[PDB]
Amino acid sequence: ILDPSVVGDEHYRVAQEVIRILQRYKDLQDIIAILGIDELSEEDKQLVNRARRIERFLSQNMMAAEQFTGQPGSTVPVKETIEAFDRLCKGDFDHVPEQAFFLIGGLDDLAKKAESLGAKL
Amino acid sequence: TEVIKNFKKGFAATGVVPDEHVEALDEDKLAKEAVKVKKPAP
């Protein structure tokens, strides 16, 4: 059902953008493994930073994981998720550290953790 | 060919420095090149 006629045009567009960014990151993983990130293009560096932040934002604190960490779970509506990952792919959070995307819920959790890490959005 | 040529003139293709949100450098980290003059004159 990941289909423009089922989930909507914007849902599909954002999902395809996330997938394209992560696929280019996986394509670059060879050079990134040997030489690091500083040899890439400027556009490739931008995209790899976006991809690290995206692959960290897809993480989440689950309700069933409170037994392992003690941190309660999160529920993110699909519209907030679409809006968030749209802003991620567009490039709004390239300044926030790679953490503060790690095991959170929506954008409010992102802002709170980012300001706990000394950043603003 | 001519239809393409007369179409390309009216086509509206969709082609500024970003913010980078980098904090300001500490005014005392910026080193100052000084002439170290030996006459005390406040």
Added chain:
Amino acid sequence: YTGSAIAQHWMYEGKHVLIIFDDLTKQAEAYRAISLLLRRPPGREAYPGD
């Protein structure tokens, strides 16, 4: 299995038992030996299906 039986006898009496299986890889190798000597068809890494 001998160790596990000796331990379960105590477990079912209300005791607390700890059992260490020094190597389960070597038990798997012995069982694979037995299974290949019985001409049973092997699977991944020539290990039995079970």
Added chain:
Amino acid sequence: ATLRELRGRIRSAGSIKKITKAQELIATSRIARAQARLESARPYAFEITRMLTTLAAEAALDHPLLVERPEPKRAGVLVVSSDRGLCGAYNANIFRRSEELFSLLREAGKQPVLYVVGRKAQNYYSFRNWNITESWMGFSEQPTYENAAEIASTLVDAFLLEGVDELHIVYTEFKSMLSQSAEAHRIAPMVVEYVEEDIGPRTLYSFEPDATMLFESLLPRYLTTRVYAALLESAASELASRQRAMKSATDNADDLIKALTLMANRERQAQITQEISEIVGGANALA
């Protein structure tokens, strides 16, 4: 199938590892040479500084390069980076330092004008739609005094004038062979720093034709000497960064070789086992 691909990837990683180890040793040699050049250029800088200080102690300190113009509107930033790219975070640290400097300038109402030295800075700023006034490439490996003279002359002529009110420079200070720090210096206008008295029965100097003419013909030479020292230090720092980057790169290539060899041997065993399974399955099917 993937046995061929795994052996090919092992060969590729071996080639990369050989090249990176060669580059690391070459960078060691070249930074020895660069440190030599820097240390031998030091004495002229020391003595021109001494001559300038003993000229300024008895002159008129109203040279254009010494007064802070009221209401500065623009600042000139010279960003010294590299041409070859196998360095580590060298250009990265340079650019983050220059971005901190740009935000410092904009928090005081000065729109920065940008001059760069190297190819990596031009990539970094042409990607971000910046307007670089003048560029300089091809001499970040072995900078000479004529390049420093050209750079400093264009800088002071844009300062004395489309015209800027102060000159900054962002380069990598070299120290310790393990310290490479991107620093932002303010080369113009100079602050004046009354040091000491150090003048008792000491004999006064004699100037020909006078004090201020010598001072005003010696100041641009001082700024050029400072730019030359900056270029030399940034070259030595780039070579240190390249040596470390190539060491880590050859270590990563070694670990990739190890992992690929492990997976290739795993597959090799798996292929032999599966082939034996097929052969014996057919042989049993026939019996």
